[PDB]
Design an enzyme around this catalytic site. Structure first.
Site, PDB file in Angstrom:
ATOM      1  N   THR A  87      74.813  25.857  42.064  1.00 17.63           N
ATOM      2  CA  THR A  87      74.889  24.771  41.161  1.00 17.63           C
ATOM      3  C   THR A  87      76.225  24.488  40.839  1.00 17.63           C
ATOM      4  OG1 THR A  87      74.680  24.117  38.790  1.00 17.63           O
ATOM      5  CG2 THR A  87      74.625  26.351  39.377  1.00 17.63           C
ATOM      6  N   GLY A 107      59.081  16.262  24.906  1.00 19.04           N
ATOM      7  CA  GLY A 107      58.281  17.330  25.040  1.00 19.04           C
ATOM      8  C   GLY A 107      57.981  17.406  26.426  1.00 19.04           C
ATOM      9  N   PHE A 167      52.674  10.228  22.562  1.00 24.90           N
ATOM     10  CA  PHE A 167      53.668   9.713  23.337  1.00 24.90           C
ATOM     11  C   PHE A 167      52.994   8.480  24.125  1.00 24.90           C
ATOM     12  CE2 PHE A 167      57.686  11.761  23.635  1.00 24.90           C
ATOM     13  CZ  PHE A 167      58.352  12.126  24.758  1.00 24.90           C
ATOM     14  N   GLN A 208      62.810   4.249  36.723  1.00 23.90           N
ATOM     15  CA  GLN A 208      62.384   3.959  35.382  1.00 23.90           C
ATOM     16  C   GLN A 208      63.513   3.558  34.468  1.00 23.90           C
ATOM     17  OE1 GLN A 208      60.275   7.399  32.487  1.00 23.90           O
ATOM     18  NE2 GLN A 208      59.111   5.970  33.654  1.00 23.90           N
ATOM     19  N   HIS A 225      63.836   3.499  30.546  1.00 24.43           N
ATOM     20  CA  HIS A 225      63.504   4.045  29.281  1.00 24.43           C
ATOM     21  C   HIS A 225      63.799   3.074  28.319  1.00 24.43           C
ATOM     22  CE1 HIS A 225      62.440   6.744  25.868  1.00 24.43           C
ATOM     23  NE2 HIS A 225      62.226   7.617  26.832  1.00 24.43           N
ATOM     24  N   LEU A 274      69.757   8.327  25.037  1.00 27.18           N
ATOM     25  CA  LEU A 274      68.470   8.256  24.861  1.00 27.18           C
ATOM     26  C   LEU A 274      67.991   8.476  23.357  1.00 27.18           C
ATOM     27  CD1 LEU A 274      65.668   8.389  26.099  1.00 27.18           C
ATOM     28  CD2 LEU A 274      65.608  10.762  25.786  1.00 27.18           C
ATOM     29  N   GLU A 285      60.862   8.816  22.975  1.00 28.96           N
ATOM     30  CA  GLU A 285      59.563   8.142  22.917  1.00 28.96           C
ATOM     31  C   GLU A 285      59.129   8.774  21.802  1.00 28.96           C
ATOM     32  OE1 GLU A 285      56.721   7.860  26.535  1.00 28.96           O
ATOM     33  OE2 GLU A 285      57.745   5.786  25.995  1.00 28.96           O
ATOM     34  N   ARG A 333      55.932   3.146  30.032  1.00 29.01           N
ATOM     35  CA  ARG A 333      57.453   2.865  30.006  1.00 29.01           C
ATOM     36  C   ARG A 333      57.888   1.504  30.530  1.00 29.01           C
ATOM     37  NH1 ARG A 333      59.170   8.796  27.998  1.00 29.01           N
ATOM     38  NH2 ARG A 333      60.463   9.078  29.989  1.00 29.01           N
ATOM     39  N   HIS A 363      66.938   5.654  33.449  1.00 28.76           N
ATOM     40  CA  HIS A 363      66.448   6.997  32.850  1.00 28.76           C
ATOM     41  C   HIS A 363      65.735   8.016  33.892  1.00 28.76           C
ATOM     42  CE1 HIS A 363      65.013   9.422  29.469  1.00 28.76           C
ATOM     43  NE2 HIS A 363      64.220   9.909  30.213  1.00 28.76           N
ATOM     44  N   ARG A 408      56.718   6.760  35.943  1.00 25.78           N
ATOM     45  CA  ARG A 408      56.866   8.387  35.564  1.00 25.78           C
ATOM     46  C   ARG A 408      56.008   8.233  33.958  1.00 25.78           C
ATOM     47  NH1 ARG A 408      60.984  11.108  32.051  1.00 25.78           N
ATOM     48  NH2 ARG A 408      59.498  12.360  31.018  1.00 25.78           N
ATOM     49  N   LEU A 438      59.662  17.182  32.892  1.00 18.46           N
ATOM     50  CA  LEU A 438      59.636  18.671  32.475  1.00 18.46           C
ATOM     51  C   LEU A 438      58.487  19.516  33.134  1.00 18.46           C
ATOM     52  CD1 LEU A 438      61.046  18.498  29.011  1.00 18.46           C
ATOM     53  CD2 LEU A 438      62.247  19.358  31.007  1.00 18.46           C
TER      54      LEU A 438
HETATM   55  C1  LIG Z   1      67.985  11.887  28.253  1.00 15.75           C
HETATM   56  C2  LIG Z   1      66.780  12.361  28.971  1.00 15.75           C
HETATM   57  C3  LIG Z   1      65.896  12.760  28.175  1.00 15.75           C
HETATM   58  C4  LIG Z   1      64.566  13.242  28.926  1.00 15.75           C
HETATM   59  N1  LIG Z   1      63.564  13.924  28.127  1.00 15.75           N
HETATM   60  C5  LIG Z   1      62.509  14.090  28.591  1.00 15.75           C
HETATM   61  C6  LIG Z   1      61.350  14.737  28.017  1.00 15.75           C
HETATM   62  O1  LIG Z   1      61.479  14.813  26.780  1.00 15.75           O
HETATM   63  N2  LIG Z   1      60.360  15.186  28.494  1.00 15.75           N
HETATM   64  C7  LIG Z   1      60.108  15.310  29.895  1.00 15.75           C
HETATM   65  O2  LIG Z   1      59.148  15.550  30.645  1.00 15.75           O
HETATM   66  N3  LIG Z   1      61.421  14.674  30.656  1.00 15.75           N
HETATM   67  C8  LIG Z   1      62.207  14.139  30.315  1.00 15.75           C
HETATM   68  N4  LIG Z   1      63.423  13.698  30.878  1.00 15.75           N
HETATM   69  C9  LIG Z   1      63.335  14.036  32.280  1.00 15.75           C
HETATM   70  C10 LIG Z   1      63.549  15.224  32.624  1.00 15.75           C
HETATM   71  O3  LIG Z   1      64.519  16.183  31.759  1.00 15.75           O
HETATM   72  C11 LIG Z   1      64.309  15.724  34.171  1.00 15.75           C
HETATM   73  O4  LIG Z   1      63.727  14.621  34.943  1.00 15.75           O
HETATM   74  C12 LIG Z   1      64.522  17.104  34.422  1.00 15.75           C
HETATM   75  O5  LIG Z   1      65.182  17.711  33.449  1.00 15.75           O
HETATM   76  C13 LIG Z   1      64.843  17.301  35.690  1.00 15.75           C
HETATM   77  O6  LIG Z   1      64.922  18.625  35.823  1.00 15.75           O
HETATM   78  P1  LIG Z   1      65.536  19.173  37.212  1.00 15.75           P
HETATM   79  O7  LIG Z   1      65.719  20.642  37.224  1.00 15.75           O
HETATM   80  O8  LIG Z   1      64.968  18.336  38.640  1.00 15.75           O
HETATM   81  O9  LIG Z   1      67.286  18.471  37.587  1.00 15.75           O
HETATM   82  P2  LIG Z   1      68.342  18.342  36.523  1.00 15.75           P
HETATM   83  O10 LIG Z   1      67.895  19.057  35.143  1.00 15.75           O
HETATM   84  O11 LIG Z   1      69.101  16.930  36.405  1.00 15.75           O
HETATM   85  O12 LIG Z   1      69.215  19.407  37.003  1.00 15.75           O
HETATM   86  C14 LIG Z   1      70.155  19.381  38.355  1.00 15.75           C
HETATM   87  C15 LIG Z   1      70.876  20.497  38.906  1.00 15.75           C
HETATM   88  O13 LIG Z   1      71.079  20.233  40.197  1.00 15.75           O
HETATM   89  C16 LIG Z   1      72.429  20.449  40.304  1.00 15.75           C
HETATM   90  N5  LIG Z   1      73.150  19.827  41.350  1.00 15.75           N
HETATM   91  C17 LIG Z   1      73.212  18.559  41.396  1.00 15.75           C
HETATM   92  N6  LIG Z   1      74.096  18.189  42.331  1.00 15.75           N
HETATM   93  C18 LIG Z   1      74.634  19.309  42.863  1.00 15.75           C
HETATM   94  C19 LIG Z   1      75.271  19.839  43.877  1.00 15.75           C
HETATM   95  N7  LIG Z   1      76.017  18.792  44.605  1.00 15.75           N
HETATM   96  N8  LIG Z   1      75.431  21.201  44.436  1.00 15.75           N
HETATM   97  C20 LIG Z   1      75.030  21.982  43.393  1.00 15.75           C
HETATM   98  N9  LIG Z   1      74.090  21.638  42.588  1.00 15.75           N
HETATM   99  C21 LIG Z   1      74.066  20.364  42.469  1.00 15.75           C
HETATM  100  C22 LIG Z   1      73.310  20.565  39.122  1.00 15.75           C
HETATM  101  O14 LIG Z   1      74.341  21.338  39.127  1.00 15.75           O
HETATM  102  C23 LIG Z   1      71.968  21.015  38.093  1.00 15.75           C
HETATM  103  O15 LIG Z   1      71.963  22.248  37.882  1.00 15.75           O
HETATM  104  C24 LIG Z   1      64.520  13.292  30.383  1.00 15.75           C
HETATM  105  C25 LIG Z   1      65.645  12.603  31.034  1.00 15.75           C
HETATM  106  C26 LIG Z   1      66.569  12.382  30.408  1.00 15.75           C
HETATM  107  C27 LIG Z   1      67.743  11.988  31.107  1.00 15.75           C
END
Ligand SMILES: Cc1cc2nc3c(=O)[nH]c(=O)nc-3n(C[C@H](O)[C@H](O)[C@H](O)COP(=O)(O)OP(=O)(O)OC[C@H]3O[C@@H](n4cnc5c(N)ncnc54)[C@H](O)[C@@H]3O)c2cc1C
Ligand SMILES: C/C=C/CC/C=C/CC/C=C/CCCCCCC(=O)OC[C@H](COP(=O)(O)OCCN)OC(=O)CCCCCCC/C=C/C/C=C/CCC
Ligand code: HEM
Ligand SMILES: CC(C)Oc1cccc(NC(=O)c2ccccc2I)c1
Ligand code: SF4
Ligand code: F3S
Ligand code: FES
Lengths: 153, 250, 129, 616
Positions: D42, D57, D124, D245, D247, D257, D260, D291, D358, D403, D409
């Site tokens: 990471t 949530g 939601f 998407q 938001h 953000l 919702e 959304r 978003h 979405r 999450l």
């Molecule tokens: C402001 C906001 C609020 C949200 N609220 C909600 C919610 O209430 N409920 C819900 O269901 N969803 C929500 N979402 C959507 C959801 O949070 C995300 O889609 C989810 O967190 C994505 O998880 P993930 O592990 O796929 O990636 P992320 O959590 O984006 O993590 C990405 C990881 O990949 C790594 N990475 C990236 N590029 C590289 C690289 N080149 N080399 C090594 N590592 C790399 C990063 O270091 C990081 O550790 C929200 C999104 C946002 C933006």
């Protein structure tokens, strides 16, 4: 003997050394705040007092001098009355403030009065009460010594 | 134009004989966002791409941008820029941490210590991992408020003069509040074993109630209160209440 | 180019692996508690000695202050007697010196209450100036 | 590699995860539990991952507020997708919700609570009881305002028990491919400028999304679509990229953000009239419509002069009418964020908000088991050996064209776990770690050096910006074929300006000038593929809305009765996944199209949901 993490921690410090990495400035750059100034003070007073007890106790023992012939030597100088009572105030304050703030900190040890308003009220109250007690204990008798000098018989 | 000037700590480990510096950068406040992070970015992009710092979230939740601004440890992304241009605003990295480059400190001792507390739920009766919910009342879970918010930004640990002088043995306010977040979790059984891990005279007890942590925390949390609570617990002045019993119909 | 050398795992604290074989119990807890109880007890004493003087208060001031300041300086010493900055032998020499500071302190005070005016009296005599 | 020396360092792992957010970590836990030598790469400390910024949530039919059924959630999820969703994967997502979220709690995630002691659930966007007939559902499990924060910190916490070995602040350059099979990753260690080649029997890609492709987003500075860039560079076509998407409620000035959750707790959107306009655009679900529908609602109101503020270019989200005991118990973070950024006391004034980039439903294509896939017209879904993808970086596709709120999450935890589960049950320990082919990652290094000492006229920050600015203007909430075509025309030019890149910082140790330039390259791949896809989809579905094609083109017209129609062929309708294949060096993209999977995983468990009109 150490926990496992404290072992780890020391090994960490060793790498950090060996990488000739600098340590981010701290006391030189950190903002003066009532939080730490007062801790600084509590230790500074606490320590000064001990040091006076050591340099005092042991000093007068290892010298041909005694405490009586010392108090004449300074009196001899006949230094002004305001200066003297200020040196008295200086002696009272460490004793007062540390004693007060000592109890304050014991609250902090017990999770009590730990929010920021409590922290700042606590601070001021303890600087106040200590100064008041230090100004009272200096002046009050000096005030009674002026009542003696000039009163009806 | 309104030109704010920043004094920004520099260090380049690459260069031979290199020693820390302070560099002035002038920023037009009218061509720049409200927050100190915004200035650093502007400066990186428009003036000096070698200026190096940590950031992610633009909203004060990741904790990556923690640094020392205007004398205090805060997050750059929710610190307003000081509008008064006759002041120079000073920006150093988290005090008393080894640096890698510019505003980026080696953060790994911090992290290792947070591992040491075992930051995960423990239960003395093996549970079927997916099967049902642990009971916890509202009151019980509300003990976690002001505790689970911590973003691991290290602002407070790096404001503690005791953690300055003994980072290697004293855990410090961040890791200690979190140690306590798992102690008073009613759903957690291992309170006693958690306390056993910091009995000694340094781990927890080198807290000398200086209070710079609770002060500086950019999330408006209180570690000094949590540590105090640990001291009471660690000296048997108090105990963890037992969990409210899980009601029959649940 | 990618002609390379096998790497190793980055240093990293394994909290479970560390847990295997370390059990040790040394609760500083019961020691800390009394250090504070003792300071709490001194709160009465300090003004008690403003008012009531004598060779017997000189003695209790001398005993409480010796014992309190012992734990005081010890701390201060562990806070700044750091091996990273001093290297162990020289820093264990500061540890030991915290005890020499306790024993000289008492020695000095005892002397001063026995072959000189005493604490309370010494305070009188500066306040008279 | 021309003009410098590079310390390469080789490692051998059972499985290597790129990512340490929700998806990444949940995968790691399951793998380390099941025994594997797991390595997690990471580019930031895992807590800084974007997951930590999530709020409202995570959905599951726990029934903590009213009786509930995962089939209803399934329904709402598919209606959500506007039938671009693969229903097998949407089935796996929802079937396993109750268990996945329970685990989180069983791990010590500190969910808010009901008087009964159970996990608190809020309402939601785009959800409902009894397959759309019932009321506004309460499925969205929340830790107050900061569900994402608590979930990630918990997972990270429990990931320290699983003996999974962390490589923190390693920037992943490329996948290590050996004839269509992935044998690992190559990355740059920021602490010392060393280069690392991870050999591994599996590779899970969990890198998050690409919000920073645009000028204004809620995403973190680190959402650069690296994982999608990686796949694109491994010759893997990306799917559904045009589905972006917006938001409905990011703060007007700053993109932060506002959840919702704040609507589903009783907040509503308000225009310049003072009208609660969502009652027109969506009478049944009002301000909890999906959304894409809400954002478009606002976007019109702005267009038609009911905008708000000085310039009449955002709308208000109103909360002050709610009790403060509820505003602090349920929305404490956004209470504070609105103070810090908008100057707003949320209990007395409304928040200035506006639709904002978003989520990225698009990404790396996979099957129900999260195994990355390539697609031929005549051979079909051919799995890429060794590679897996999950979270925002994936396109399973569980979201299709829209979405649902609190479904990501979930997707991250569910399909993250699914990676561990599916790998335990397909990888046996006779098979050894793949030996690297010679010259592995040599080109990835060549790019590093090239970017590192880049000479040209155009600095790296200038280019990013005009990428972001272009994209905001040409691939927005409402799109047209000419604007889009002009937007492709400009984007493909910016791709050429990449050759004239200036960088300045020459170091290897912690060089953010360098990595941000690597990120910029990665963002160009996503943005170019996103827009050509968007330019060509002559329809309107989910987030993707064409002014000049405002109907949703499916196989039948699902607005007439169906019996007595004739199925349009694949080529003439649009109910298919867009696939984008980019030569990374030339930049040339070619499209393809891949059928949407309509079967559920088991009809004896749940019946596939036929397309209808999408009416919230
Ligand atoms: C402001 C906001 C609020 C949200 N609220 C909600 C919610 O209430 N409920 C819900 O269901 N969803 C929500 N979402 C959507 C959801 O949070 C995300 O889609 C989810 O967190 C994505 O998880 P993930 O592990 O796929 O990636 P992320 O959590 O984006 O993590 C990405 C990881 O990949 C790594 N990475 C990236 N590029 C590289 C690289 N080149 N080399 C090594 N590592 C790399 C990063 O270091 C990081 O550790 C929200 C999104 C946002 C933006
Ligand atoms: C750096 C400087 C260091 C100096 C050395 C410090 C030594 C400290 C140890 C002594 C502690 C006890 C002092 C009291 C004392 O001796 O009598 C008062 C005397 C006067 O006698 P005098 O004036 O001759 O006395 C009258 C005649 N007997 O000396 C004083 O004036 C000190 C006054 C102390 C005030 C008490 C502190 C406030 C505490 C509050 C606690 C609150 C609630 C309980
Ligand atoms: C009368 C009531 C007093 C109380 C309640 C009290 C209480 C305390 C407490 C709680 C500490 C620990 C501070 C810390 O850990 O940071 C302390 C430290 C100390 N006290 Fe006192 N004290 C009193 C009087 C005195 C006196 C008269 C002296 C005279 C020499 C003294 C000398 C010290 C010293 C040297 C320390 C050193 C530790 C440090 O600052 O960290 N104290 N005291
Ligand atoms: C510069 C300020 C912010 O910081 C400093 C610098 C030097 C010493 C200290 N204060 C202590 O060292 C101290 C004081 C009282 C109790 C325990 C301690 I470890 C604080
Ligand atoms: S406590 Fe406040 S400051 Fe210390 S880490 Fe958690 S958040 Fe950062
Ligand atoms: S700054 Fe340090 S010593 Fe204690 S209360 Fe705060 S932790
Ligand atoms: S950049 Fe996230 S805390 Fe400032």
């Amino acid at each position: 003997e150490k926990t496992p993490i404290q072992v780890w921690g020391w090994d960490y410090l060793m790498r950090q050394r060996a990488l000739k990495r600098p340590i981010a400035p701290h006391l030189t750059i950190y903002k003066p705040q009532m939080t730490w100034m007062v801790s600084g003070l509590h230790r500074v007073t606490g320590c000064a007092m001990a040091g006076t007890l050591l340099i005092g106790g042991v000093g007068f023992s290892v010298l041909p001098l005694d405490f009586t012939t010392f108090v004449e030597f300074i009196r001899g100088l006949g230094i002004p009355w305001v200066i003297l009572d200020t040196f008295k105030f200086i002696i009272a304050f460490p004793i007062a403030f540390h004693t007060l703030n000592g109890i304050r900190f014991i609250g902090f040890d017990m999770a009590k009065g730990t929010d920021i308003p409590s922290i700042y009220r606590g601070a001021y109250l303890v600087l106040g009460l200590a100064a008041l007690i230090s100004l009272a204990v200096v002046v009050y008798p000096r005030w009674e010594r002026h009542k003696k000098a000039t009163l009806p018989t | 134009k309104r030109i704010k000037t920043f004094e920004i700590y520099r260090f380049n480990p690459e260069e031979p004989g290199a020693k820390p510096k302070l560099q002035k950068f002038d920023v037009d406040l009218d061509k720049c966002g409200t927050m100190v992070l915004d200035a650093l970015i502007k400066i990186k992009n428009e003036v000096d791409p070698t200026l190096t710092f940590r950031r992610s979230c633009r909203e004060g939740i990741c904790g990556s941008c923690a640094m020392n601004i205007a004398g205090e440890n805060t997050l750059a992304c929710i610190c307003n820029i000081d509008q008064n241009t006759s002041k120079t605003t000073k920006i150093y990295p988290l005090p008393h941490m080894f640096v890698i480059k510019d505003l980026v400190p080696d953060m790994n001792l911090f992290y290792a210590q947070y591992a040491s507390i075992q930051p995960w739920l423990q239960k003395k009766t093996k549970i079927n991992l997916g099967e049902k919910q642990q009971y916890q009342s509202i009151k019980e879970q509300e003990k976690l408020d002001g505790l689970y918010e911590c973003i691991l930004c290290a602002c407070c640990s790096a404001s503690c003069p005791s953690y300055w002088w003994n980072a290697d043995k004293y855990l410090g306010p961040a890791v200690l509040m979190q140690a306590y977040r798992w102690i008073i979790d009613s759903r957690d059984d291992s309170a006693a074993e958690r306390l056993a891990r910091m009995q000694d005279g340094f781990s927890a007890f080198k807290c000398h109630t200086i209070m710079n942590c609770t002060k500086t925390c950019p999330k408006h949390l209180n570690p000094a209160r949590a540590i105090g609570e640990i001291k009471m617990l660690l000296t048997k002045m108090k105990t963890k209440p037992a969990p409210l019993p899980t009601p029959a119909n649940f | 180019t990618s002609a390379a050398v096998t790497g190793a795992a980055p240093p990293q604290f394994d909290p479970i692996a560390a847990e295997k074989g370390f059990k040790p119990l040394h609760s500083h807890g019961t020691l800390f508690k009394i250090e504070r109880y003792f300071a709490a007890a001194m709160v009465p004493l300090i003004p008690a000695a403003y008012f009531i003087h004598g060779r017997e208060m000189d003695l209790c001031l001398a005993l409480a202050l010796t014992l309190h300041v012992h734990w005081g300086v010890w701390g201060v010493v562990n806070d700044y007697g750091r091996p990273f900055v001093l290297g162990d032998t020289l820093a264990a020499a500061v540890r030991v010196g915290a005890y020499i500071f306790t024993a000289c302190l008492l020695a000095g005070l005892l002397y001063f209450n026995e072959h000189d005016v005493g604490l309370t009296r010494a305070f009188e005599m500066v306040w008279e100036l | 590699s021309n003009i410098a020396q590079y310390k390469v360092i080789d490692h051998a792992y059972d499985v290597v995860i790129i990512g340490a957010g929700g998806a990444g970590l949940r995968a790691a836990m399951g793998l380390g539990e099941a025994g594997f030598k797991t390595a997690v790469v990471t580019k930031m400390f895992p807590t800084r991952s974007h997951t930590t910024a999530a709020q409202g949530g995570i959905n599951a039919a726990l029934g903590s507020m009213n009786p509930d059924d995962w089939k209803w959630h399934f329904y709402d999820t598919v209606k959500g997708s506007d039938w671009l969703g693969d229903q097998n994967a949407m089935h796996y997502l929802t079937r396993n919700a109750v268990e996945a979220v329970t685990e989180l709690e069983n791990f010590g995630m500190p969910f808010s609570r009901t008087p009964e002691g159970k996990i608190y659930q809020r309402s939601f966007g785009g959800q409902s009881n009894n397959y759309g007939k019932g009321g506004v559902a309460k499925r969205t499990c929340c830790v107050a305002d900061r569900t994402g924060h608590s979930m990630l910190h918990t997972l990270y916490g429990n990931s320290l028990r699983c003996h999974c070995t962390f490589f923190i602040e390693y920037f992943a350059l490329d996948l290590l491919m050996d004839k269509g099979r992935c044998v690992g990753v190559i990355a740059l260690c920021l602490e010392d400028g060393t280069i690392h080649r991870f050999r591994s029997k599996r590779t899970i890609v969990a890198t998050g999304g690409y919000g920073r492709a645009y000028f204004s987003c809620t995403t973190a500075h680190m959402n650069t679509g690296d994982g999608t860039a990686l796949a694109t560079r491994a010759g893997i076509a990306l799917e559904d990229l045009e589905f972006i998407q917006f938001h409905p409620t990011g703060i007007y000035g700053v993109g932060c953000l506002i959840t919702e959750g704040s609507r589903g707790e009783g907040g509503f959107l308000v225009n310049s009239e003072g009208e609660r306009f969502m009652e027109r655009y969506a009478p049944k679900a009002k301000d909890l419509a999906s959304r894409d529908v809400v954002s478009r609602a606002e976007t019109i109101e702005i267009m038609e002069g009911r905008g708000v503020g000085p310039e009449k270019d955002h709308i208000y989200l109103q909360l002050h009418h709610l009790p403060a005991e509820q505003l602090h118990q349920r929305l404490p973070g956004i209470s504070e964020t609105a103070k810090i950024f908008a100057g707003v006391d949320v209990t007395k004034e409304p928040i200035p908000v506006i639709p904002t980039v978003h989520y990225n439903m698009g990404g790396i294509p996979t099957n129900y088991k999260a195994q990355v896939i390539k697609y031929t017209k005549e051979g079909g879904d051919k799995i890429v050996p060794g590679l897996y993808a999950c979270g925002e970086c994936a396109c399973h596709s569980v979201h299709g064209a829209n979405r649902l709120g609190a479904n990501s999450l979930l997707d991250a935890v569910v399909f993250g776990r699914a990676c561990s589960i599916n790998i335990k049950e397909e990888l046996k320990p006779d098979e050894k770690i793949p030996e690297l082919p010679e010259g592995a990652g040599e080109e990835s290094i060549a790019n590093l050096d090239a970017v590192r000492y880049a000479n040209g006229d155009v600095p790296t920050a200038e280019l990013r910006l005009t990428m972001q600015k272009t994209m905001q203007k040409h691939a927005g909430v409402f799109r047209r074929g000419d604007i889009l075509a002009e937007g492709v025309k400009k984007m493909m030019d910016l791709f050429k300006e990449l050759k004239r890149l200036k960088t300045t910082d020459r170091s290897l140790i912690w060089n953010s000038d360098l990595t941000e330039s690597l990120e910029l390259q990665n963002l160009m791949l996503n943005a170019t593929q996103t827009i050509v896809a968007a330019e060509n989809r002559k329809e309107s579905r989910g987030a993707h809305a064409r002014d000049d094609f405002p109907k949703r083109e499916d196989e039948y017209d699902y607005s007439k009765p169906i019996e007595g129609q004739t199925k349009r062929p694949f080529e003439k309708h649009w109910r298919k996944h867009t696939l984008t294949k980019q030569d990374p060096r030339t930049g040339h993209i070619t499209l393809d199209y891949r059928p949407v999977i309509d079967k559920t995983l088991d009809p004896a468990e749940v019946d596939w949901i036929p397309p209808i009109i999408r009416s919230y």
